[PDB]
């Protein structure tokens, strides 16, 4: 009569998605011999079994993924009585229910121009206008002086991503604007940062 019951079916919460990353909050195991967790990514017709043997935490994050691609995640706790081959065969475990989610799109910029601040008197200071399209939060935006090719990249804005983004404090000159949005996850330290998508066109700001 003695037995070793399988772990209960894994239950996944909403899939927090960031480009090249993921976050899945699952349930709490109850069986006495749970020793690992795994997930079967399904991109198109390709299936990837990502396995995490750490039971300490109850949140997971897939380090590597394909940008802007709908996936499918199925998770499952497994006991000690399940071997690598058995787990590969999905035999003797309770797999989570299907869940669909899509990846995020890195920010991209449409334009950049210099505009003088509307003022009631005097010479209003220039304010840089850039139109941003993408998916992120508190995207960072930088600039590079075009006088020399070795000039540093200077951050100028980390505020929330908007269809139109404005900021001041830009000295008169010509600059190449660079953007790379960020998106965090509930996990304590996981932060997602895209590549740099610089504007091909150089723009100049003047009074």
């Amino acid at each position: 009569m003695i037995s070793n019951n399988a772990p209960a079916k894994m239950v996944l919460n909403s899939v927090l998605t960031g480009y090249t990353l993921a976050y899945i909050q699952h349930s709490i195991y109850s069986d006495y011999d749970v020793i690992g967790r795994s997930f079967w990514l399904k991109e198109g017709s390709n299936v990837t079994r990502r396995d995490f043997t750490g039971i300490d935490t109850f949140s997971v994050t897939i380090n590597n993924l394909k940008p802007t691609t709908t996936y499918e995640v199925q998770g499952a706790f497994y006991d000690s009585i399940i071997d690598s081959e058995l787990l590969n065969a999905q035999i003797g475990i309770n797999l989570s229910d299907k869940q669909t989610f899509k990846m995020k799109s890195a920010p991209r910029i449409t334009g950049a121009r210099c505009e003088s601040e509307p003022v009631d008197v005097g010479v209003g200071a220039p304010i840089v206008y850039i139109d941003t399209t993408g998916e992120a939060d508190y995207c960072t935006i930088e600039l590079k002086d075009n006088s020399n090719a070795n000039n540093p990249w200077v951050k100028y804005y980390v505020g929330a991503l908007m269809p139109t983004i404005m900021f001041g404090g830009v000295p008169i000159g010509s600059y190449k604007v660079r953007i790379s949005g960020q998106i965090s996850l509930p996990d304590g330290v996981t932060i997602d940062s895209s590549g740099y998508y610089e504007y091909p066109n150089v723009f100049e700001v003047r009074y």
């Binding site: 709490i28 750490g54 071997d83 690598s84 509930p186 996981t190 940062s193």
Partner: protein, 265 residues
Amino acid sequence: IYTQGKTWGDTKSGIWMGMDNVTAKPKLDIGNATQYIRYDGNILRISSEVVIGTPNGDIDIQTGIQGKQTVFIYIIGTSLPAKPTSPAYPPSGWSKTPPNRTSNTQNIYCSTGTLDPVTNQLVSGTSWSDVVQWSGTEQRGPGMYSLAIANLTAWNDSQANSFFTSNFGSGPVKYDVLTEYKSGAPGTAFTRQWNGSAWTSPAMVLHGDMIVNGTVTASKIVANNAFLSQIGVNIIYDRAAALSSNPEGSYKMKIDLQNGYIHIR
């Protein structure tokens, strides 16, 4: 230049900034009676707690950052083996999952240190734990944490409690600290350390690194790691015994003061 009625170091709320002709020293006073930033010619006082730096200020934008922990059971072994030396999640010819064994052999695991998913190997340092025979089935060290909130206006104890009881499923431990920032505005943030019950905001917060050419004195210091050339101490408990048990009944301790001895317990 000052709000009407306000004077340097006056109770009524306002601001004040101007000269002190007799002392020939600039003066500044901003804030309420209880909270204020007052600067005489010789001292700067800030009653209200100050936060310097911003969350995730000095991160790599090319690549993010993340942390993970792994524990694998990895031998069909007749005798206790020597712990791995290669820092690779699959160690040197070493399995990643508990294999099948013959009656004579046994199973031995290792509490592998933190794993780095980006490199898929043990982070620099933190070698493999002591190998222990796996019989049947196999508190957490307080650490620093940060969380993102969609629309944050003030500290949210409920959100932090939900965070800990969701991720770790066990609630925060003493000396834990969580910083909450508004999504879309990392500049606005709130930080609090959980001690005893509920959260107490600290008198000051720093987000980058602190460099002091001189000395530092504090009532107590907690850090996940330290590298000290010379250390002088009278008593040294174990971390768990030191913080978990106030009476320090259970321990594995050294005693430099008074009689010096080694106690195993």
